């Protein structure tokens, strides 16, 4: 298992990769030819010289690191490479004896993998104790997080500040070290963007400590919610401290991410459906007296929240919940058109309305029960990872009496069978070979009893046999996820467009719902878009939602019956994509109007919260006046918490923002009660200094959060979108301000006048973000300068707003006031002038290969700039995908092309950095570097794994599942390669057009 956990490992193995390729390629012609072998006497000690230094340090670490933890696995570890150290020099001198020795041919090549194992084995084994000190430091962080309740006095928090102070400084600097020591930039990003938060919420915690002891003096009603302020934020920081455990424990390329990242929607669902329940039913209990205010949108999101449950749960189950909601929605829409004729009152057609209310009850039952049958595999997957490496513990010591220990590895291996009893029901075929071999290791577990009558020298014998067996048990459960989680979606919509696109040819053979759930994903968001939009467009967009949604089963049948190549199945798939093209441009325009509305009052009710929280005299019902402002605050943010996800739905950008904006969402989600709890306790003792400034922490902690939201969500959308949306919003509100002056409305006028001002400052805010992101002042000077006109004309707004506030029939003021609006409209029109451009036993690597085989058809049909490297990668990626389980005699090109897979990868990285320095935008350059970092990270690994596979090839006494594990490394990481390439081939032009 040649790992790539640390920079120091690749700096040593890639030398050794050159070294063992210098000799295994010669071992070929010992086998395939038996010719006069060239005298490689000189590499023998020289490759030993690349090892003996590590051996002696490996002995020196035994000679120096005195804690027995590394002394239990590492001294057995270099025994193997010292067993390699025995044979390769004997392999030398026997080849000195005989150029043709069959007892040397086997003899040298057994060591060559024992090198590449054992070299790689030792370098991770160095990294073992390297990071376990950091775990205790992380535990020491968590120690203070256990002390984060211990503080009961103001003096204690100062000492606690004096506790965390050296702790946090000791913390982050070691984190910077492993940042340097790592090479997965996508996982490097995981580490730092955890670490900045736990530093950032740290004074917020300390401020919460400040406010707690003040409330410990008087407001011991608040120490309830201040603990709720505290312990949540304590649990918030400790969550990433829990998360950086597996970041530290991330030994190799991750598989467990999406199996754990997609657990979010279930906890999202269960706390959401209960709230959408009552507002749906009593809405639909009086149907024709319910026009669709929010229960229709509740009924909509009930379909939508259950719609992502079917994205999670799959198999035969995914046809069922998709069926019953499509059943329910047409049942409701039948009743919704019983409202248009209106003849159904509350008892008129209740026979239908109960079968709808029970029909939704089927929808809510199957989602909450498949939920526990979704998360149960993840309960076992974390469980099964514990005992597979616990194998090294008891196999190390030959114990005569580990009978209490015998029940531990005995019954937990039976709990692996319980996990196999959890693994069983999803499939049958691959199940029974695992459901048979689960008892096969119990026979080896039965072998623990006989030598458990005190026998050491055979406890080492089956140890090699259970060495293959233990990892084989995990590797089958490693396969248990490609048939228990369906083919997941891109968070990119255009990725899901591609995910939709690839499924159209061969539906059944792929991982499940690669387009089918992607079509289920793409259509379920337009439903989330259409409901908030207005009535006559609502069903109109639902018409555009459901005219393509009727193609769900219509494209789930032409491979389920017959083949799709019949033209009544081809054109029915071909007329699909025409209407499906009509989705995104509406769905973009759908989201476009939303964000310009919901982010209008971005800080505004918060200031209304603030002036509510500023001066209450504790009069009656004025706290209730705050309560609706408090109610406004969620109702503002809950729309904001809704929209930014829908902004993330149609973002059309980097992953990094759209993975980062969702992180910004849940900050704004979870700080939203943290605001109110801070806002309430300021209302409990108004006028207190420490209450005010801690509010001024937390409130301003929310602002720059929602500013970081604001400044990213408009970056999450395009500037063509928002300006037109701003322009149409401001002309409408000015007309709303105009018809407020048609009648006598002064106060609604000046509120709308200030509504311009809060939106005008937003416009100038966007004009800053272009300039700091544009590299050069090509015209971004005018982006300042037109916003400089805004900063001029913002002041005649409010001044005239007061000046027109005297009379609705103020003579000539409204002439100036519409002109004051007309000053804005030409200015925002100048912002449009800115952003214009015019101044063969494995074939899963086949799926990796046939990926970029189909991305050959993009960006043009005429020329090539970088593509030719990617396609000569792809055909060699196609060639190896044969050859990995291919013929048993051409393992030389396994490495000889992996040389190019090193080479042609990082050639593109050279091509990456040059257009990065050619481009005129730092964000596309920052997005280019985060994706092109992994290209050399991956590149040399495929050299390394090809060597291991050459030792797997022609071996004829390998436990072939380990070769299958070696195949799986060539499976996943070439898939991880091929996916990562087209990201750059996207940004080959997705960035380059910005010039």
From Swiss-Prot:
Record membrane topology: Peripheral membrane protein
Residues carrying Phosphotyrosine: 537, 822
Sequence repeat ranges per the UniProt record: 259-369, 370-479, 480-589
Annotated region (Talin-interaction), positions in chain: 168-208
Stretches the record annotates as N-terminal globular head: 1-835
Post-translational events: Phosphorylated; on serines, threonines and tyrosines.
Localization annotation: Cell membrane; Cell junction, Adherens junction; Cell junction, Focal adhesion; Cytoplasm, Cytoskeleton
Subunit structure: Exhibits self-association properties. Part of a complex composed of THSD1, PTK2/FAK1, TLN1 and VCL. Interacts with APBB1IP and NRAP. Interacts with TLN1. Interacts with CTNNB1 and this interaction is necessary for its localization to the cell-cell junctions and for its function in regulating cell surface expression of E-cadherin. Interacts with SYNM. Interacts with SORBS1. Interacts with CTNNA1. Binds to ACTN4; this interaction triggers conformational changes. Interacts with FLII.
PANTHER family linked to this entry: VINCULIN
Protein name in UniProt: Vinculin
Record organism: Homo sapiens (Human)
